[PDB]
Amino acid sequence: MPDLLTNVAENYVNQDLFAGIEWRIDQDGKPIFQGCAGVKDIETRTFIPKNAIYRIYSMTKPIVSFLAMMLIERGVFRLSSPIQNFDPRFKSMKVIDQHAHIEPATALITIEHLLTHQAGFSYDWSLGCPISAHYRDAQLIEDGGRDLTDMMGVLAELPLVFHPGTQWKYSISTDVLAHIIECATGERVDDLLQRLIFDPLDMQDTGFSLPLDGASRLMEVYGMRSLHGLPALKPAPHVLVPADLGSSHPTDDPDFRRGGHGLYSTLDDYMAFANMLLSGQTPEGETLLSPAVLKLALAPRVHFGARGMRINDEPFAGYSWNLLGRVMTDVGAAAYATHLGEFGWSGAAATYFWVDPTKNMTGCVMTQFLGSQHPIGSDMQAAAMSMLG
């Protein structure tokens, strides 16, 4: 009966840990819990505006992954398609190890490898990684103004950190997927997303640049975590200071497009996407993805021994990986309230969403903090789970 969600968010605001938080939980496609706390920015203490806009970072990945499943259904490519068929710059990959040894890859990177992060790619911010220094030198994440097509050419000449298919490592591979989608279709990934997903779902505020009236709605982003600097040996201190994004995340670049980050969205827009994932259909009943392929996308695909699923050694307890993100496969190993089959993902600025099929439930938490030492997304899911019967 107590509003645990409001208690969590208000404590976070009152302890100066987050500037502003929005949340909404839907059941059967209708809101049952929602609220907001704090402000758009602590500098002017402006209230969170209507249709506030958030940098959702890695919550871009489930959207681009869902687009890939749609193109698979349409026969554009298949899970086993070697990506080198569409961009030969990814022919003849190499593999580097922690002992300075480099050898040719023994398997081709496939579409499935990209979707499961089993391709062998890494990330500029990967701590202790045998290749992340070369990502940083190449400015893959730092240089947001560089066209997706050109960024991929630079990336394609670097070695992988394991042979495709043989391990899991969370990676820049969703960006490779967005690029390969462009090669396979002859279209741009932002145009495909607009036509195939955003327009049918009425997500009119979602895209890689701001809407014309969007500058006043953009939430300020705080925190010290860098996605392209020298990887931190200890978590950056949790202080509400505005974050410097450099040129990594432009607001008004009409060619900026990526697969692993870069979308702007709103709470309402992302909830439309999350609700669709319960069925593969728009609210009006138009099918975006057949039930069979949605099931293929959601079924647990990567299993972990233990240490479990980890990103920069942070755990995702009880979660396996499917083609769109995490999926709860063992409630007895979960670190916070959930149900078997709950799935979703999150972003580096602490945005978080989940879909819980056993409860016909979706939830989303929107905020802007890079490098939180506090797992607000999981605290809010837990609170919402605890508020059902």
Place this chain on the structure above:
Amino acid sequence: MPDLLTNVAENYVNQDLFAGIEWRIDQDGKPIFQGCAGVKDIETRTFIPKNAIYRIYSMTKPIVSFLAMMLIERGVFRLSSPIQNFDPRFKSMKVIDQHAHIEPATALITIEHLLTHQAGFSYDWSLGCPISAHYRDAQLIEDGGRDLTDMMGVLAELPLVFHPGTQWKYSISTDVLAHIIECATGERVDDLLQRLIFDPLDMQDTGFSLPLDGASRLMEVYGMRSLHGLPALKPAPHVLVPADLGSSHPTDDPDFRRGGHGLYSTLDDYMAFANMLLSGQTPEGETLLSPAVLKLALAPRVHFGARGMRINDEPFAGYSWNLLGRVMTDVGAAAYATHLGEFGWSGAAATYFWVDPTKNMTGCVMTQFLGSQHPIGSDMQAAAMSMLG
């Protein structure tokens, strides 16, 4: 004490197992036992001529291997030199396995890999081999009239059967070595052998073609083993019937040259080579190979598990492999009399030699039988061992 050598050889001749046999044992560079038995050919029972000529087959390999060591000493290349530096056709090798899987090699083939048969090559006659079928289709051994340079081009396009350096399999790699010697020097391997080995050791009857007066001295070859046909599931029966060599082993082709077989020689010529291996010097005292590099070439280099060294599953008990051939590393595992450090090799037509530094002893048996079911070379070594210290 009695002459076991003569007894062994006479019994083989009298049991119609071999047509004719010559042998010599030297100690301190001088003959101590010698003899002959049988005839040049059983069809006419012509007597074994003076300086009878034999096809020594794989006893070519220690000679070509020794030539490689001479060139390493002279700075032409080194053990660690990748052979692709000298012939780019051996860039980008592939590896096939018994489950039909093919992948790029994870290491470059080196000179050392060729000398140790750890490069991953195989042989046309290798039974159960994942690639030998493709060797036979290519007629690598069958087509003796094909120039060494051209045969290597065909071989280079085929996959290896393991990653270079990771296993041992007796192979066509000595032929690759002869070719790479030609690439590295710009000279022909048969000219280099003539100038650097045969002439200084007065091996006047040794070469890839018969000498001018050689036809009348060539011993007849018997037996039914095939080095290029479909590998036999059971050893070919031991029948003293002349062998059909096809065009694999021409007598008067001035361009025929190989690394792994093909030399003609005589008992006296091969004993000059074997005696030199006790010191690296000619009888006069010219150094063909310094003591340090001779030690480098003779030291045990490939060690074997409990299965031991095997060729088509036939054992070489207690032997390890050095850069020139076999070397006895455990008398307690040996299947016939020997001493620690005894080394040498043998040929498919049952020629056999050894060098025993603990006794300052060399020995060579010459005969012509392809596919003997009777290990005459080992029987003669054992006899000589029993007759000396």
